[PDB]
Amino acid sequence: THKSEIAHRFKDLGEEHFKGLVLIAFSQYLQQCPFDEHVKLVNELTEFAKTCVADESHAGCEKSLHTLFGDELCKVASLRETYGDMADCCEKQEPERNECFLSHKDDSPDLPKLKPDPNTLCDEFKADEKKFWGKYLYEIARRHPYFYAPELLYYANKYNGVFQECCQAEDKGACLLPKIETMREKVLTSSARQRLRCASIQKFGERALKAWSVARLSQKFPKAEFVEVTKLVTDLTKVHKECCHGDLLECADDRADLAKYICDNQDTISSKLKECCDKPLLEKSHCIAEVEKDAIPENLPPLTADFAEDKDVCKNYQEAKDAFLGSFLYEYSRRHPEYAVSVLLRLAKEYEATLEECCAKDDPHACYSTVFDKLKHLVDEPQNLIKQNCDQFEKLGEYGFQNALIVRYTRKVPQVSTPTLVEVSRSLGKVGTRCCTKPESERMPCTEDYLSLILNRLCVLHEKTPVSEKVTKCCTESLVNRRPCFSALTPDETYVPKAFDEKLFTFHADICTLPDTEKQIKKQTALVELLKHKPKATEEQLKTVMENFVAFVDKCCAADDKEACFAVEGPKLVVSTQTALA
Numbered sequence: 001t002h003k004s005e006i007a008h009r010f011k012d013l014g015e016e017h018f019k020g021l022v023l024i025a026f027s028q029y030l031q032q033c034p035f036d037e038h039v040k041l042v043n044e045l046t047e048f049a050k051t052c053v054a055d056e057s058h059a060g061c062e063k064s065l066h067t068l069f070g071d072e073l074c075k076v077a078s079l080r081e082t083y084g085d086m087a088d089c090c091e092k093q094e095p096e097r098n099e100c101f102l103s104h105k106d107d108s109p110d111l112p113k114l115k116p117d118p119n120t121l122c123d124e125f126k127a128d129e130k131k132f133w134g135k136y137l138y139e140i141a142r143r144h145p146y147f148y149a150p151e152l153l154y155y156a157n158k159y160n161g162v163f164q165e166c167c168q169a170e171d172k173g174a175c176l177l178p179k180i181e182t183m184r185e186k187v188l189t190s191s192a193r194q195r196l197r198c199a200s201i202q203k204f205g206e207r208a209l210k211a212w213s214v215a216r217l218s219q220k221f222p223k224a225e226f227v228e229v230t231k232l233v234t235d236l237t238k239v240h241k242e243c244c245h246g247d248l249l250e251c252a253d254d255r256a257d258l259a260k261y262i263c264d265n266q267d268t269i270s271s272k273l274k275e276c277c278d279k280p281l282l283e284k285s286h287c288i289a290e291v292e293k294d295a296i297p298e299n300l301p302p303l304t305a306d307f308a309e310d311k312d313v314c315k316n317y318q319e320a321k322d323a324f325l326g327s328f329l330y331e332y333s334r335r336h337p338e339y340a341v342s343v344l345l346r347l348a349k350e351y352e353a354t355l356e357e358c359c360a361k362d363d364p365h366a367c368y369s370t371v372f373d374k375l376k377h378l379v380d381e382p383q384n385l386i387k388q389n390c391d392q393f394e395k396l397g398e399y400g401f402q403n404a405l406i407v408r409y410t411r412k413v414p415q416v417s418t419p420t421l422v423e424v425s426r427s428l429g430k431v432g433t434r435c436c437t438k439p440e441s442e443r444m445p446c447t448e449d450y451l452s453l454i455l456n457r458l459c460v461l462h463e464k465t466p467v468s469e470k471v472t473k474c475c476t477e478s479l480v481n482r483r484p485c486f487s488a489l490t491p492d493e494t495y496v497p498k499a500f501d502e503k504l505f506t507f508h509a510d511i512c513t514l515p516d517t518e519k520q521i522k523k524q525t526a527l528v529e530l531l532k533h534k535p536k537a538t539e540e541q542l543k544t545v546m547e548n549f550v551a552f553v554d555k556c557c558a559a560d561d562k563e564a565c566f567a568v569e570g571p572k573l574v575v576s577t578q579t580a581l582a
């Protein structure tokens with residue numbers, strides 16, 4: 001329909017944005033190459049796009065976006081030498097070649113943890129604002145190779161606006177570190193949301209993403225009609241599909257478009273959008289993404305009416321399954337803005353399973369008329385876990401809770417690799433902080449949605465190199481029952497203990513020197529390995545091993561010759577610990 005896709009997107013996005021997405025795209029496809037390779041790729045591509053803008057007939061201007069990006073990545077001399085089997089993608093035709101690159105996205109790339117000097121940072125910034133802006137896109141995007149790319153350009157500006165307001169202060173440090181931290185959460189979170197949106201389509205079909213889009217949209221805009229929501233849903237699903245499939249130019253473009261549409265139709269969508277719609281382009285879509293719920297309209301009928309009472313349920317459903325089910329989702333979501341999206345989807349799935357068996361039965365209506373009680377039962381099911389988990393969080397504090405979750409997970413999925421068990425248990429206990437201080441009514445929803453983000457990370461880390469059958473099962477059985485499914489696991493008897501490996505339990509003076517985070521991780525790693533070796537260790541003993549350990553580090557980090565003390569106290573500690581675990 002357009003002579004030249006690259007021309008079209010360049011015009012549409014404008015140079016600056018066009019360059020920032022190309023970079024992000026290269027940086028996600030190729031997470032090792034240094035910055036500088038990438039800025040070369042970015043400009044080559046952009047020069048060429050400029051030629052196509054001026055003359056659309058010009059050779060190459062007709063190629064697809066994959067073919068052009070892909071053409072550019074094959075010309076990397078580093079490929080075979082840096083990326084291994086990656087350079088074999090270059091031997092294929094499109095679209096297999098593109099598929100092949102995308103399958104080498106690495107969810108755990110192992111990159112220097114970003115230690116920033118407020119000084120060096122305000123330097124680099126005053127020297128080159130635009131290169132700074134790019135550098136940040138690169139570093140985030142290479143570490144989060146599914147990160148929502150237009151939402152990333154948004155963060156890059158906010159980053160830049162943080163230094164524009166803070167480098168001209170006197171105590172720059174004190175202005176920066178708060179704002180950086182606050183932003184840097186928001187970015188990890190955004191990444192994990194985005195990774196779960198891609199994990200939907202990839203493992204469960206565009207229909208799962210589409211359904212997410214209904215739940216989210218209906219909650220946010222419950223005034224809007226099904227017909228309208230249905231429109232926004234088609235557009236929102238395409239943005240995310242394109243986005244997850246690495247088509248960032250299309251992603252950005254259709255997203256800007258959808259914001260423009262939403263604004264031009266506030267009267268049929270929401271009363272909360274005034275403030276959003278007066279913002280510039282990137283900020284507009286974010287504000288929208290964050291806008292407040294609209295008020296549930298007034299005389300809505302019972303849901304029982306359309307979905308349980310009505311004798312024609314099986315008729316409407318057989319006629320168009322996903323559409324009818326989208327309607328259930330709109331109707332349920334628009335009335336329960338408090339609920340977790342995971343929950344709404346969990347309800348929709350169950351209502352599906354229900355019609356699925358009931359419409360094949362002799363009087364469907366007797367079977368399905370009773371379904372809402374079953375749904376009431378599901379929403380109430382998880383409430384006691386919360387309580388247990390919050391009390392435990394309050395008693396132990398965040399860090400102790402991370403430890404309890406380390407033990408807990410290591411017993412249920414001890415075949416999981418240790419890096420993954422530590423990362424995930426650390427995130428799981430950050431849920432305590434996120435959700436436990438909230439008013440009770442709010443807790444279950446909060447938790448349900450965070451645990452989905454986090455359990456997805458486990459599934460995604462594990463599916464890379466799969467080792468535990470239970471995890472594979474929970475990860476592939478569903479998205480929306482993962483939390484129940486993980487919560488229903490228990491330690492197992494099949495597991496042979498890991499042979500003692502002393503190397504994993506030695507400590508050196510370095511331990512005193514590490515940044516705090518890295519110090520926690522090193523101990524939580526030991527803790528995991530301990531449970532893999534001693535999977536029956538009881539909680540009182542582990543309390544002993546844990547006090548004894550803190551006494552040990554404390555003694556040794558206080559000593560005149562710390563090495564000597566570690567050398568000596570070290571083996572003492574292995575010995576008691578080996579002794580205490582019978």
Ligand SMILES: COc1ccc2cc([C@H](C)C(=O)O)ccc2c1
Pocket residue numbers: 193196197200208209211212216341342345449450452453479480
């Ligand atoms: C089909 O199941 C899903 C898909 C995507 C989800 C994304 C999210 C994040 C928290 C979101 O921003 O809504 C939560 C639950 C989800 C369930």
Ligand SMILES: COc1ccc2cc([C@H](C)C(=O)O)ccc2c1
Pocket residue numbers: 200204207208211322323325326329345346348349477478479480481
């Ligand atoms: C339009 O109705 C749907 C469609 C797809 C769904 C998928 C899922 C997830 C992926 C699942 O865990 O099976 C949940 C609910 C859904 C409702």
Ligand SMILES: COc1ccc2cc([C@H](C)C(=O)O)ccc2c1
Pocket residue numbers: 385386389390393428429431432433435436447451483486487488
């Ligand atoms: C802050 O409240 C929480 C924190 C972590 C939790 C982890 C889990 C996992 C699924 C588990 O227990 O297996 C469940 C509930 C949780 C509630």
